[PDB]
Write a protein that binds this ligand. Structure first.
Ligand code: FMN
Ligand code: JBW
Ligand code: ORO
Length: 378
């Protein structure tokens, strides 16, 4: 790929445009501008074949490379194709809710370039389960005609509308509408921006949530070719956890995860523990990026040991480099999700991080990425 060709994600003009937008334009306007470029398929694309030695898996989920885009980036599944073609193996769309929501008062997204941090108080703004399902169906039909997207994975993050009293009613509604089209379902009980959502991480409540979601997915088969997704199998079930939990809570959750046989755990969502970023002093919400890296890596180590290495991990939190990715993997993660990396590193994010990790796996003496999983604990 030529360095001065516009189709190349590493093309210098992308970093110039991004640096300008990061300096002078409102955060959510930048994000919506990126989604618009994606929607009209004007984004650059990765033309390199991914290394077979950096492939990974979670059960039957075969990731072509270890990098995906975390939930909350393409909330409505409006440009799945364009984001994936930047060089990512998967994307988690959503978080979606049964009815659409505009979310919390704007401005609600703020970036701190020096510390590579983001604070947000979005509050699950999305078009609603029915409209997002239409968007995902359209992608599944495009994927069926395009061989280049046949191995890319799409997960769906599901949550509850703000006014819903019982979360399970909302999760069931989403499963019944979008479940048939998802490779995996991520249960979001960790947003800090929906009042009382995090209370669902209590052991007793979480167990009922997991068993009800699993029962609802299992009933799609019982009541009714059926799977219009990548795997051609029922979606796996993941739980996304908050890093703001005590040791007693983490241990109780781990015991529930082992008993309910969850397919994976996403570690982690944003934190409410970071109070040292000056430009975020009077801002509300959860913090993402570099200040979240150490907290979430420590949380991966803890959960990997609490679950006795039986539950696969999806890493989320401050991953910017090949070095950051390897640290997550040796801590116990099987795959990585990026968010803040796309915001601060731009279009080149996937191409660059994949190169850095392949080089690092070679320097460290690993034959493949699978050999590195949980190696800190070996
Ligand atoms: C503006 C914004 C919106 C987000 N929305 C969601 C969401 O809807 N669902 C979710 O599970 N996580 C959401 N997240 C959390 C990210 O998926 C991710 O876990 C977090 O940003 C930490 O990763 P990072 O340090 O690489 O950014 C959001 C993050 C940001 C910055
Ligand atoms: C990767 C990228 N590239 C661009 C370009 C370019 N080139 C122009 C405008 C926005 C761009 N982006 C962004 C995508 C998302 C961005 C962002 O700031 N998101 C909000 C949640 C924090 S900034
Ligand atoms: O929509 C949001 O506010 C949101 C959801 C989530 O899970 N995490 C986050 O930081 N923001």
């Amino acid at each position: 790929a030529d360095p001065f060709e516009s189709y190349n994600p590493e093309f210098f003009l992308y970093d110039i445009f991004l640096k300008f937008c990061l300096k002078y334009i409102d955060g959510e306007i930048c994000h919506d501008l990126f989604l618009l470029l994606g929607k009209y398929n004007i984004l650059p694309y990765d033309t390199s074949n991914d290394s077979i030695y950096a492939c990974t898996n979670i059960k039957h989920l075969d990731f072509i490379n270890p990098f995906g885009v975390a939930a909350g980036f393409d909330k409505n599944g409006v440009c799945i194709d364009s984001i994936l073609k930047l060089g990512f193996s998967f994307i988690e769309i959503g978080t979606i809710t049964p009815r659409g929501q505009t979310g919390n008062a704007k401005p609600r997204i703020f970036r701190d370039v020096e510390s590579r941090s983001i604070i947000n108080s979005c509050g699950f703004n999305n078009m609603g389960c029915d409209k997002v399902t239409e968007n995902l169906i359209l992608f599944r039909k495009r994927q069926e005609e395009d061989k280049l997207l046949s191995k890319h994975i799409v997960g769906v993050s599901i949550g509850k509308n703000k006014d819903t009293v019982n979360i399970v009613d909302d999760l069931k509604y989403c499963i019944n509408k979008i479940g048939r089209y998802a490779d995996y379902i991520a249960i979001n009980v960790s947003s800090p921006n929906t009042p009382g959502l995090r209370d669902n991480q209590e052991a007793g409540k979480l167990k009922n949530i997991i068993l009800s979601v699993k029962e609802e997915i299992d009933n799609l088969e019982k009541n009714n070719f059926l799977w219009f997704n990548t795997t051609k199998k029922k979606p796996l079930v993941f739980v996304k956890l908050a890093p703001d939990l005590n040791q007693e809570q983490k241990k109780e959750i781990a015991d529930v995860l082992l008993e309910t046989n969850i397919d994976g755990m996403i570690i982690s969502n944003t934190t409410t523990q970071i109070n040292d970023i000056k430009s975020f002093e009077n801002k509300k919400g959860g913090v993402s990026g570099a200040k979240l890296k150490d907290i979430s890596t420590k949380f991966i180590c803890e959960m990997y040991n609490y679950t006795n290495k039986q539950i696969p991990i999806i890493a989320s939190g401050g991953i910017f480099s090949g070095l950051d990715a390897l640290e997550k993997i040796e801590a116990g993660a099987s795959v990585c999700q990026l968010y803040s990396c796309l915001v601060f590193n731009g279009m080149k994010s996937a191409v660059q991080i994949k190169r850095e990790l392949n080089h690092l796996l070679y320097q460290r003496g690993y034959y493949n990425l699978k050999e590195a999983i949980g190696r800190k604990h070996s």
